[PDB]
Amino acid sequence: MEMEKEFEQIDKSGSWAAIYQDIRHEASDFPCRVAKLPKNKNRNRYRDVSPFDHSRIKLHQEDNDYINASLIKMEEAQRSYILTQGPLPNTCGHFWEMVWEQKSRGVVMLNRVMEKGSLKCAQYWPQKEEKEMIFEDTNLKLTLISEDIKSYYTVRQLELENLTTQETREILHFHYTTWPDFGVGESPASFLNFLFKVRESGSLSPEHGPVVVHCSAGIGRSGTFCLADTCLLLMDKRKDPSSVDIKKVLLEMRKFRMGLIQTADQLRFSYLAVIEGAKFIM
Ligand SMILES: O=C(O)C(=O)Nc1sc2c(c1C(=O)O)CCNC2
Ligand SMILES: [Cl-]
Ligand SMILES: [Cl-]
Ligand SMILES: [Cl-]
Ligand SMILES: [Cl-]
Ligand SMILES: [Cl-]
DSSP, X not given: OHHHHXXXXXXHHTOXXXXXXXXXXXXXXXXXXXXXXXXXXXXXXXXXXXXXXXXXXXXXXXXXXXXXXXXXXXXXXXXXXXXXXXXXXXXXXXXXXXXXXXXXXXXXXXXXXXXXXXXXXXXXXOSSTTSOEEETTTTEEEEEEEEEEOSSXXXXXXXXXXXXXXXEEEXXXXXXOOOOSSSOOSOSHHHHHHHHHHHHTTTTSTTSBOEEEXXXXXXXXXXXXXXXXXXXXXXXXXXXXXXXXXXXHHHHHTTTSXXXXXXXXXXXXXXXXXXXXXXXXX
8 A cells, every 4th residue: 555655665766775774773682692502502503593582482301492493472463483493403303392392283484405505404304104203302203194285385284293192283384395596586476375375274373382484594584474474464453554564563573583584685575575465365
């Protein structure tokens, strides 16, 4: 609406880089003391991407509670997300332990395991039904039950079993497999359709623990996904639906995890997605 004209003004004035750098400058700065402890060095994929102490997810088993993951609690929009890095070969057990302990129903993956020939995320789920994964450190078993592969994303039904209690849970794995190789997409259509499929699944509902969202570092594409989702919620909730200020929402989110949205293009793409998505919900 008005937001759509604000978008055009930024585009003609070429102000995207300027707006994005204002966000980085105004962003919250809270301590990440635990993330930076010597014993956690090999639980961080990127030394420059750490959870704040105040919002980090704590693992419940006995020896080291640390995982590189943040609870993002959007109060007005009434939605919570856990944003986390793509797990490492040694933190896959921690990752599924977090999913169990936080009672998550869905996992949203926004990257491929390898991109431009670099390892961005461990193969943390089973690719074959008959080859289940056992995480001996956290005593969990994970089985591929079935998968629905579409052109722009794949949804997998996973069975997560607490080998301690033999309780099992169905986890939905929403894998957006087609984020553009460089930059962002020309159109937000495919990303928006993926978002709506996650919503339709029930994985985001408050009856469940927060959805777990990750990319490689858990801040760039992950930030895009949560920012768009939250802004679209706010546009549907408010009686003044164009009072939604995307920059303000992003700064609110950045109180809970650093660095959400990593490029001016991703900020532009987020605006595009919220604009076109708000029209879809109409
Ligand atoms: O996957 C994403 O969208 C994301 O946040 N990626 C990020 S953020 C980020 C890095 C990466 C990476 O993948 O190399 C490396 C250096 N520090 C910041
Ligand atoms: Cl230490
Ligand atoms: Cl992959
Ligand atoms: Cl929803
Ligand atoms: Cl706002
Ligand atoms: Cl940043």
